[PDB]
Amino acid sequence: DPFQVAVGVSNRHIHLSRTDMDTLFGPGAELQRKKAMKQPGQFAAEETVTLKGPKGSLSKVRVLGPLRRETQVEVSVADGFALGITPPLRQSGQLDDTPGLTIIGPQGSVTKDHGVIVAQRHIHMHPSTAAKLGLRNGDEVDVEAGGERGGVMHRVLIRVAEASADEMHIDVEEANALCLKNDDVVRIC
Amino acid sequence: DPFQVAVGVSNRHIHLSRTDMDTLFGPGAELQRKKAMKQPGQFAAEETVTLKGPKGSLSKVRVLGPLRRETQVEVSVADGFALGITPPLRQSGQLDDTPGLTIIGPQGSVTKDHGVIVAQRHIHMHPSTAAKLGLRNGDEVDVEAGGERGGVMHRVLIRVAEASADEMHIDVEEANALCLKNDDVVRIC
Ligand SMILES: [Zn+2]
Ligand SMILES: [Zn+2]
Ligand SMILES: [Zn+2]
Ligand SMILES: [Zn+2]
């Protein structure tokens, strides 16, 4: 069944620019791969940061490599409340009018004015697969999960790129709400 | 639309036996009302406890009144993970083969061998409403939630009792996963 995609539960994490990486970890510092992810080229790094908000802070927030053009922080709704901000629901890269935080690293700190979002659930899909299912990049779909806490998720963003592996990304709260874990199978409706 | 029902977002909390109330807060100690809930006679009390598990503790956990015949602890999956336990998904009062933890109050502590659960989402329903919708106690329904993070929750238990107001109860993670909040309106399918 080509409609079955595996689940990747995305914990809170951060993408860093080269400039911000230099500030937080020192000039010329390279991310060290800790664990390779399903999406090709992407990985969880050894490096982590502390996120400080007006209300509180979060420690050991994972940095995901590779480095990107713009810094982006992804936190759960609960994470936001603990920090003392209200990050809006957004797809990756949609950072206009988003709130900021203070990122703290070993070599320095940077207080961002934007880049913090709650991740909108989505499916990374190969263009081959997307072509089969008659799905276009930018589409939204329904996804069903089984089990004692199962249900159907609306507004699942379809993300098609050549450098993609078939996988669904949901944050920790979405996963727990449906009793989903890494490598669980869900179905596109 | 009579199939619509208001949402009550349920944060972690505890119900206490009289015996356990005596231990934690002193013999003869009465729960003090802070804020009444929508369910008749029930209320969030001024009293709070600390929950201690093998891995960590949670402070300021709300006690809900009135007292009951058996102590019951409701926590989210995330809460359980932080405590160092794995509570199963259960309906209220369904406490067979459940993990325990240590409850700490001002006057003493008690270590329970059972009674910790992750709450199964449910709808409290007055018999008149139940008769009008064609629902019975113990039935399970689907509930649709709208909005950017909307979707359809499966396996929603119907709890029919005279001392009930029409209201759906979901925990913090289920609420955040769907961007629901208190007094939001969802619809029974
Ligand atoms: Zn990300
Ligand atoms: Zn993703
Ligand atoms: Zn309860
Ligand atoms: Zn309830």
Q: What is the DSSP letter of A120?
A: P
Chain B, nearest residue to A170 by Cα: B177
Question: Which SS3 state, helix, strand or coil, does residue A36 take?
Answer: strand
Q: What is the DSSP letter of A52?
A: E
Whole-number Å distance between alpha carbons of A158 and B87: 34
* CA-CA-CA-CA dihedral for B140, B141, B147, B151, to nearest 10: 80
Whole-number Å distance between alpha carbons of A82 and B57: 17
How many other C-beta atoms lie within 10 A of the C-beta of residue A135? 17
Contact B102, B109 (CB under 8 A): yes
Question: Which SS3 state, helix, strand or coil, does residue A123 take?
Answer: strand
Say yes or no: A152 and A184 in one domain.
Answer: yes
- Token digits of residue B90: 């259960």
- Token digits of residue B130: 């139940």
Q: How far is the CA of A95 from the centre of ligand 1 (A)?
A: 12
Say yes or no: A145 and A81 in one domain.
Answer: no
| Interface test with chain B among A149, A153, A157, by most B beta carbons within 10 Å | A149
Say yes or no: B111 and B176 in one domain.
Answer: no
Whole-number Å distance between alpha carbons of B132 and A95: 47
Nearest to B53 by CA among B32, B36, B78, B71: B78
Say yes or no: B63 and B149 in one domain.
Answer: no
Would the CA dihedral through B61, A88, A16, A169 be positive or negative?
Answer: positive
Say yes or no: B134 and B111 in one domain.
Answer: no
Please report, in range form, the residues annotated as the binding site of A. Answer: 9-11, 13, 15, 37, 55, 62, 68, 74, 81, 122, 124, 169, 176
Say yes or no: A24 and A107 in one domain.
Answer: yes
Q: Which of A72, A91, A120 is the last residue of a domain?
A: A120
Whole-number Å distance between alpha carbons of B161 and A167: 43
What determination technique applies here?
X-ray
Contact B3, B133 (CB under 8 A): yes
- Token digits of residue B59: 């402070």
Contact A22, A28 (CB under 8 A): yes
Say yes or no: B17 and B44 in one domain.
Answer: yes
How many other C-beta atoms lie within 10 A of the C-beta of residue A142? 14
Contact B125, B139 (CB under 8 A): no
Contact B75, B33 (CB under 8 A): no
Residues of B in contact with A172 (CB under 8 A): 78
Whole-number Å distance between alpha carbons of B10 and A67: 39
Residue B9 in marked binding region: yes
Say yes or no: B7 and B34 in one domain.
Answer: no
Whole-number Å distance between alpha carbons of B110 and B16: 11
In b/e form, how buried is each residue of B24-51, taking b as 16+ CB within 10 angstroms? bbeeebebeeeeebebeeebbbebbbeb
Whole-number Å distance between alpha carbons of A46 and A110: 20
One-letter identity of residue B137: N
Say yes or no: B105 and B183 in one domain.
Answer: no
Backbone φ and ψ for A133, nearest 5 degrees, come out as: -75, 5
Range of the domain at B103: 12-120
Q: Which of B68, B100, B120 is the last residue of a domain?
A: B120
Would the CA dihedral through B113, B118, B120, B122 be positive or negative?
Answer: positive
By CB atoms closer than 10 A (0-12, 13-18, 19+), residue A33 is: middle
Say yes or no: B41 and B91 in one domain.
Answer: yes
Q: Which of A120, A152, A167 is the last residue of a domain?
A: A120
User: Under an 8 A CB cutoff, do B176 and A77 touch?
Assistant: yes
Whole-number Å distance between alpha carbons of B169 and B20: 25
- Token digits of residue A120: 């909108």
Whole-number Å distance between alpha carbons of B105 and A48: 37
What is the resolution of the experimental data for this entry, in Å? 2.1
Which among B78, B149, B151 has the least Cβ separation from residue A152?
A: B151
Say yes or no: A16 and A42 in one domain.
Answer: yes
Alpha helix positions (H), A26-87: 77-83
DSSP string, chain B: -TTEEEEEEE-SEEE--HHHHHHHH-TT----EEEE-SSTT-EEEEEEEEEE-SS-EEEEEEEEES--SS-EEE--HHHHHHHT--PPEE-TT--TT----EEE-SS-EEE-SS-EEEEPPEEEE-HHHHHHHT--TT-EEEEEE-STT-EEEEEEEEEE-SS--SEEEEEHHHHHHTT--TT-EEEE-
Backbone φ and ψ for A166, nearest 5 degrees, come out as: -65, 110
Say yes or no: A114 and A126 in one domain.
Answer: no
Q: Count how many domains chain B has.
A: 2
